[PDB]
């Protein structure tokens, strides 16, 4: 098993244990790179109401290695949590936060009633928009939705509406949602595994940056360029 | 001119089983009652939708 010898863990705490979350109309994103992503904490923790992966298994995340990990952080109502998935439609899926139908990543969410509820109206969503969003698209606009021109009124509205989060609300309680999108180029974020001694000129079961197979590893004189991670044969195999 | 179940600009694209024309005269203040979800002298006792 061979990975870059990185001793720095990925800042999931700054995403999942954050003091404030973004409104869904303007969900925030943090790019995770040059670190070791320990997913056993997120998976095994009992604080989560749901942990659903679509292009990966939640228990294979530690063996896999990705080239770029994105954490999308926002707050929605409990009855809208089901919309944070590929192949979905609905007020959030279509106008606030859309995932691609071929989405690869994990959707992690939990009840934050004891943190966000007050009523807490600092969390906004789009009620109106001219057209549907593309996957991972975000847009901030207050243009009045229709013919009104700058004047709010009947049959024309300010695009955003707030959530009213109160401690006594479950489908109307706030949920904190973090979506980890996994781009699978050189390794950037690998799981919590150690590198082992390399053995060559023998048949081995290998794992190089998440790439696995069986074969004999030998020293070679292939003229790899400084930017290249691996090479391919005429048959386009490693 | 107001439509409730359909858009008013799609009426020539749409097709329907049958349509009935309910034709009558009322006072202007009661015109607002000729709509779904309304109450009042007409909506409750004369012409309910």
């Amino acid at each position, epitope marked *: 098993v061979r990975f870059p010898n990185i001793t720095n863990l990925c800042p999931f705490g700054e995403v999942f244990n954050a003091t404030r979350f973004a409104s869904v109309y303007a969900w925030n994103r943090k790019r995770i790179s040059n670190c070791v992503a320990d997913y056993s904490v997120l998976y095994n923790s009992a604080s989560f109401s749901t942990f659903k992966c679509y292009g990966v298994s939640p228990t294979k995340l530690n063996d896999l290695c990705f080239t770029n990990v994105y954490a999308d952080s926002f707050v929605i109502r409990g009855d809208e949590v089901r919309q944070i998935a590929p192949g979905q439609t609905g007020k959030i899926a279509d106008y606030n936060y859309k995932l691609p139908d071929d989405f690869t990543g994990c959707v992690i969410a939990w009840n934050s009633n004891n943190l966000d509820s007050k009523g807490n109206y600092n969390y906004l969503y789009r009620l109106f928009r001219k057209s549907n969003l593309k996957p991972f698209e975000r847009d901030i606009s207050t243009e009045i939705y229709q013919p009104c021109n700058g004047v709010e*009124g009947f049959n024309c509205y*300010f695009p*955003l509406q707030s959530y009213g989060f109160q401690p006594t609300n479950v489908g109307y309680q706030p949920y904190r949602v973090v979506v980890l999108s996994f781009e699978l180029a050189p390794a950037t974020v690998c799981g919590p595994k150690k590198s082992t001694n390399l053995v060559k000129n023998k048949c081995v079961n290998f794992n190089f940056n998440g790439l696995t197979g069986t074969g004999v590893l030998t020293e070679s004189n292939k003229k790899f360029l400084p930017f290249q991670q691996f090479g391919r044969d005429i048959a386009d195999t490693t | 001119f107001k439509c409730y179940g359909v858009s008013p600009t799609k009426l020539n694209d749409l097709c329907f089983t049958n349509v009935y024309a309910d034709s009558f005269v009322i006072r*202007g*203040d009661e015109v607002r*009652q000729i709509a779904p979800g309304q109450t*009042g002298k007409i909506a409750d006792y004369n012409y309910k939708l």
Partner: antibody, heavy 118, light 109 residues
Framework: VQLVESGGDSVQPGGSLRLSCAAA????????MNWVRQAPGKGLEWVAN????????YYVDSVKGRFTISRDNAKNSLYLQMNSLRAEDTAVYYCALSSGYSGYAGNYWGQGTLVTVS | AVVTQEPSLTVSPGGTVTLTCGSSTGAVTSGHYPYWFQQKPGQAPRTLIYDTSNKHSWTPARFSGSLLGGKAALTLSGARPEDEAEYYC??????????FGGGTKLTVL
């Protein structure tokens, strides 16, 4: 969306006063234009309205026959003339823009102009 | 052409509010397309609720344009000191000749 209202001044009872409101930042002839007055220490009193195209006018019965509304769509403004103005009619008049279902009540408000009768 | 309101309401910070308005005849329904306004000292009245329950973009979402038992209301999910104001209601009738209520004063304890 700004409503600029003026014309309020100190006037004598039995006379008349013309108030006016100009629209800015929006189209005038697409909305209904309202007038509301408030005597100091009192609540709001409905005074008058006018339809988007000027074909219809509405008044609270208490000012009927005394108040008249006219407008000029090319200047984006309207005028309210009040005849036989009473000493008791001391109030701030407000211009309001109605974009609602019926056009009967305003959503946007101006700063108001003070009419004092003595 | 008579509209009445509760003269005043006192609410503790974070407490709820139920301001009421209605006509002397019939009952208040969406057909009256009720409006609610907020006026702070030195300010012009500002519309908060229009056409029964539609809330404006400048209105805190703590305010709600609900109806009660044949009456209009403006309620709060948790009042703040910033909300101290005189509130007014306006109902339509046979036409665009609306009538304002007497005014309901809201203060915060």
């Amino acid at each position: 969306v700004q409503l600029v209202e003026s014309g309020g001044d100190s006037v004598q009872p039995g006379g008349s006063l013309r108030l006016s409101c100009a629209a800015a930042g929006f189209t005038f002839s697409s909305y209904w234009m309202n007038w509301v007055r408030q005597a100091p220490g009192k609540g709001l009193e409905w005074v008058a309205n006018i339809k988007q195209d000027g074909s219809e006018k509405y008044y609270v019965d208490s000012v009927k026959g005394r108040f008249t509304i006219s407008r000029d769509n090319a200047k984006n403004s309207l005028y309210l003339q009040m005849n036989s103005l009473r000493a008791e009619d001391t109030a701030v008049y407000y211009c309001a823009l109605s974009s609602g279902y019926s056009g009967y009540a305003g959503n946007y408000w101006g700063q108001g102009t003070l009419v004092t009768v003595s | 052409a008579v509209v009445t309101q509760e003269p005043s309401l006192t609410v503790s910070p974070g407490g709820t509010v139920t301001l009421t308005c209605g006509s002397s005849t019939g009952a208040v329904t969406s057909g009256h397309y009720p409006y609610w306004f907020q006026q702070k000292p030195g300010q012009a009245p500002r519309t908060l609720i229009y056409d029964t329950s539609n809330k404006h973009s400048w209105t805190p979402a703590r305010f709600s344009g609900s109806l009660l038992g044949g009456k209009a209301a403006l309620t709060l999910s948790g009042a703040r000191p910033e909300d101290e104001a005189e509130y007014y209601c306006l109902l339509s009738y046979s036409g665009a000749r609306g009538v304002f209520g007497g005014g309901t004063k809201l203060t915060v304890l």
